[PDB]
Design a binder for this molecule. Structure first.
Ligand SMILES: Nc1nc(N)c2nc[nH]c2n1
Ligand SMILES: [Zn+2]
Ligand SMILES: [Zn+2]
Lengths: 182, 189
């Protein structure tokens, strides 16, 4: 809500809980299954059908999670990725996730990022991005990726951020089609 | 806050966002945005400020400055703060929602790729910049990989773009931040 002295984006109960309960998920598909549970919880708490979480890349320790809170939060910058990366940085007391001595961080996200989130992933210091639904899956339910540069993935890769896509794509599309139906 | 995204605003920014203010001329709007750059640098933030104004009346809606380092948040560019704070005050994610005056983002520098998408999603109908991307990069800030013809990109979404407005003063402030950036104490800073 509106504050005088802060930008303040409140989080619904499931998301506060997700950011404060201990969770180590070693396998990539474990990490992505949990992110898709957050998608489902978010849809039920009036949010867009997107979620993301920052994990320690090797251990799979969950550091923070975010979901689309654009409409209920009255904030167009409130995509899953922005919240997940920002909360991870708050937790780790730094604006730079690749700060010396911090373990390598990974953003596991329900769908390929829009142009804003593409830039946010670059500045964040995460070293790895893993996506489920593809860009055309997102467009097919009326979400816009915006004008991203051509070869956005190679843009990430050239800056030391490894990119995997398509992970539990079909599971993520099931939740997208469902949001679009309702 | 582990229960919210919470970026605190320094007092001078609370002040900027508290007092009613109307600036008709583009140069007046950018003059004010450049005062916030200097106040931000003195309040431990980066050399970047932006403000959302009603396009046709000059009424200030909200201002934002770069709070990346003090706010421990790489998303906290001036543009993201200005836009989000304006959306919070008017109680919509969409600055072009029915009933709302057309909004213009005035920004001390051309937007990086993240801020470029934020602009597109925000609903503002006008982007007005001072320093060019070349200026920003000249002192080690990185605009990142924007799409080819990013300005044409904005225009095709109906977002009119101006740049170079009070560019000299904005460059002078960038160079002054850069001269004071190092670790060796300089009383002149
Ligand atoms: N316009 C602009 N460009 C950057 N690289 C940047 N980094 C932090 N704030 C910024 N603003
Ligand atoms: Zn996004
Ligand atoms: Zn930016």
């Amino acid at each position: 809500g509106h504050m005088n002295d802060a930008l303040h984006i409140g989080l619904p109960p499931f998301l506060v809980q997700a950011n404060n309960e201990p969770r180590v998920l070693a396998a990539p598909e474990a990490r992505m299954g949990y992110v898709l549970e957050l998608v489902r919880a978010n849809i039920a708490a009036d949010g867009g059908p997107f979620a993301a979480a920052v994990f320690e890349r090797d251990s799979g320790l969950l550091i923070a999670a975010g979901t689309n809170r654009v409409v209920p939060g009255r904030c167009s910058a409130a995509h899953a990725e922005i919240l997940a990366l920002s909360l991870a940085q708050a937790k780790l007391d730094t604006h730079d996730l690749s700060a010396d001595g911090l373990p390598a961080c990974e953003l596991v996200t329900s769908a390929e990022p829009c142009v804003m989130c593409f830039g946010a992933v670059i500045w964040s210091g995460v070293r790895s991005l893993v996506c489920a639904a593809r860009s055309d899956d997102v467009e097919a339910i009326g979400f816009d990726e915006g004008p991203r540069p051509e070869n956005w993935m190679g843009g990430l890769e050239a800056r030391g951020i490894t990119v995997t896509t398509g992970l539990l794509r079909d599971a993520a599309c099931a939740l997208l089609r469902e949001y679009n139906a309702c």
